[PDB]
């Protein structure tokens with residue numbers, strides 16, 4: 228509801244803005260509240276050295292009557308010259324701050340004591356810190372000249388492009404930006420466009436888009452908007468909870484710019500901004516956190532009040548926590564209040580969950596729940612294990628959570644790390660030996676990725692019966708938790724290490740990596756069509772803690788021949804797939820071993836004598852293998868020796884007359900033995916399909 232036509236009538240006469248007395252005007256409007264006829268008369272003929280008038284400052288609030296604030300400062304002098312208006316607006320908006328009290332700035336990140344709150348990402352989803360700043364020697368955004376805006380861009384870009392380490396990146400000016408770059412910044416949510424009706428009426432859109440630009444570091448955890456609403460809008464942000472690191476990164480960039488260029492800053496106002504709402508710290512610090520139980524707690528609102536923070540919607544139970552204050556507290560204090568506030572809120576969520584988890588899951592008492600979880604989790608077993616935690620902080624309840632939340636689970640138990648299989652052995656042993664029957668853990672498991680130990684002459688080089696051959700192995704990188712118990716930095720380290728290895732793959736294994744984070748739709752559809760794409764895990768994986776921080780750290784690798792595929796950090800940290808059209812099981816497995824053995828040599832896999840290769844899902848232990856053969860068999864299908872064969876070789880057929888022959892077992896036999904069995908069995912199914 229912008230009416231610049233009406234406002235211009237009064238502005239060109241330098242007369243009092245009668246629209247402020249329109250009943251349509253926001254009752255809460257600070258310009259309406261404090262621009263009285265006497266204030267107008269007293270200041271209407273005054274100008275700053277940059278020629279800024281009272282009408283220039285109040286115009287947006289007159290054009291846009293729904294304005295909450297409704298004034299912008301054209302320059303520093305505006306804050307003093309039109310003081311009778313600005314002081315009143317500032318001390319209202321920033322109550323209880325008084326200009327007489329003075330403001331204290333502090334951008335030393337060492338003053339902040341913020342041990343990482345939630346590395347495991349159990350509650351906090353993301354952290355963000357923004358500051359607004361303006362350079363010394365120029366007007367503010369509504370008043371800055373055409374040449375000065377350009378000079379500001381030149382000076383800022385000079386500093387930003389000299390940034391090293393995690394702050395290193397690239398500047399993208401808006402002027403002359405091409406279509407592809409524009410689109411990329413849109414996908415990253417880094418792009419800004421021409422100012423809205425509030426900025427327009429403030430004169431901020433002058434010379435658009437000249438002098439405007441966007442800078443971001445390579446990690447995309449640092450962003451600068453140049454010459455938008457203020458000279459600088461500087462943002463440090465990332466997934467997870469590490470606000471101390473976020474703030475430190477922010478300070479290192481801001482202090483350098485300060486060092487080289489200098490900011491507009493006063494004792495009374497702190498850092499000067501176009502909108503008086505952004506004075507003082509110029510800061511908006513925020514955290515996304517899931518605290519559905521904290522909201523109902525009687526101390527919830529007292530915590531927010533105590534730390535001068537606020538909680539709003541953004542995802543169920545997820546709140547955007549942010550600061551309320553900018554004047555009267557330093558930037559360090561804002562961050563510290565934020566840390567302490569979020570910490571207090573999280574602890575409330577933790578208490579409620581702990582209490583709920585202190586007792587046997589009542590829902591497991593329904594005798595119609597037929598999960599292996601229900602079968603083996605006796606109340607006695609529960610009480611005996613409920614108070615133990617792995618070195619990585621995994622509880623029994625973390626392990627059984629998915630089977631509790633999803634009662635229709637077949638199994639319902641996941642391991643958060645290797646230690647779970649031992650620390651919670653009384654549960655896991657029973658589940659492993661049930662699902663992987665007849666395997667016993669005392670038997671132990673033998674891995675074997677030597678493809679030469681497989682004797683597999685090509686069964687059908689024609690292509691008559693066997694349409695395709697596929698062999699997958701699930702693996703997890705040694706030195707880390709399992710998927711459900713991964714911290715943010717572990718997952719990122721795994722992606723980095725794995726991609727590093729995969730990029731060095733030469734020959735027929737050479738390919739490229741496609742991360743899910745920042746994937747454009749074209750690349751996506753390309754992958755979908757090759758059946759290479761995976762998506763967020765279902766409710767079972769969600770409840771197990773697998774989907775944390777999706778899609779960060781997830782990605783896809785394939786070779787140029789479309790015969791080798793790697794999924795990174797999906798259900799397991801590594802899903803490695805070898806595949807060919809035709810029947811050459813031997814070739815497929817040989818390619819698989821070459822890739823897996825090399826990754827093994829460089830990184831190492833999680834593995835035990837008793838469980839073979841470790842996975843967060845107990846069903847994927849041992850070989851962690853699925854060997855698959857798309858075949859056409861009705862003759863042998865109907866043959867009375869079908870059973871004897873499919874049972875002698877531990878294989879199984881399902882239809883998708885195309886059938887899917889896959890292996891039954893994963894523990895108690897090596898990868899070599901599993902492949903040989905598949906060959907030996909599919910062979911016999913062909914030595915009937917072929918007969919006459």
Ligand SMILES: NC(=[NH2+])NCCC[C@H](N)C(=O)O
Pocket residue numbers: 287293294295296297298425456502504505
């Ligand atoms: N981006 C901002 N400066 N927002 C605060 C002021 C917004 C608008 N001028 C108003 O008075 O409601």
Ligand SMILES: NC(=[NH2+])NCCC[C@H](N)C(=O)O
Pocket residue numbers: 353354355513514515
């Ligand atoms: N804490 C976060 N992850 N914030 C991201 C959201 C950014 C968005 N501009 C906002 O409304 O704040």
Ligand SMILES: NC(=[NH2+])NCCC[C@H](N)C(=O)O
Pocket residue numbers: 674705827830831832833834
């Ligand atoms: N047999 C394996 N694939 N082991 C993977 C890990 C590397 C090494 N054998 C270790 O246990 O530390």
